[PDB]
Write a protein that binds this ligand. Structure first.
Ligand code: HEM
Ligand SMILES: O=N[O-]
Ligand SMILES: O=N[O-]
Ligand SMILES: O=N[O-]
Ligand SMILES: O=N[O-]
Ligand SMILES: O=N[O-]
Ligand SMILES: O=N[O-]
Ligand SMILES: O=N[O-]
Ligand SMILES: O=N[O-]
Ligand SMILES: O=N[O-]
Ligand SMILES: O=N[O-]
Length: 153
């Protein structure tokens, strides 16, 4: 359970993300695909992309980035009261996309990396700790739902 102070650190850095959600989504997905290339194989629309330059030029990848971060933003803004938002997401990622929890850990690492790089004004150690707690809570609750849904993850 996060404190209100922890939520405020999370939402203060998120507010900077929201100044340019598409840019941040590109940087995050590219970092994920560079760091864990196996994750790219999950995305049929753009799994053929071979290089970071190609990834930056992909309008499809950019749209996906916006989709992911907007969904996560909505969840963060709930400050842990995110049961309704998590249901469809867990279902799709468990049953349609087959995303293991391990890959949610990878994207969480990618998020933290990009925020640390872009937002050192709002992403010092305390803020990073808060965001890690928020993302750990997200993963824990998604993992619980995966098990309910029948997916080992
Ligand atoms: C912060 C974590 C994540 C959030 C909030 C998120 C959110 C979403 C959303 C909202 C969609 C569109 C609606 C849906 O299908 O549920 C989507 C689609 C998808 N997600 Fe995620 N996602 C996350 C992590 C991941 C990860 C780590 C992977 C793969 C390694 C993944 C793979 C996909 C795929 C394959 C699709 C379908 C894309 C397409 O239409 O071609 N997601 N995700
Ligand atoms: O009050 N911040 O844990
Ligand atoms: O693209 N991140 O090293
Ligand atoms: O971009 N992962 O949905
Ligand atoms: O707490 N949401 O499953
Ligand atoms: O969206 N991750 O289950
Ligand atoms: O609900 N899964 O696309
Ligand atoms: O970013 N949470 O997988
Ligand atoms: O991709 N995270 O270090
Ligand atoms: O941000 N999920 O607690
Ligand atoms: O509640 N544990 O994923």
């Amino acid at each position: 359970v996060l404190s209100e102070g922890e939520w405020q650190l999370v939402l203060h850095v998120w507010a900077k993300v929201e100044a340019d959600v598409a840019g941040h989504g590109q940087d995050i997905l590219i970092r994920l695909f560079k760091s864990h290339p196996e994750t790219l194989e999950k995305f049929d629309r753009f799994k053929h992309l071979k290089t970071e330059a190609e990834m930056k030029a992909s309008e499809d990848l950019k749209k996906q980035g916006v989709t992911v971060l907007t969904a996560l933003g909505a969840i963060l803004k709930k400050k842990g009261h995110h049961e309704a938002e998590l249901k469809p997401l867990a279902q799709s990622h468990a049953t349609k996309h087959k995303i293991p929890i391990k890959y949610l850990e990878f994207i969480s690492e990618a998020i933290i990396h990009v925020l640390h790089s872009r937002h050192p004004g709002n992403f010092g150690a305390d803020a990073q700790g808060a965001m890690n707690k928020a993302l750990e809570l997200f993963r824990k609750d998604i993992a619980a739902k995966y098990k309910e849904l029948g997916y080992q993850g």
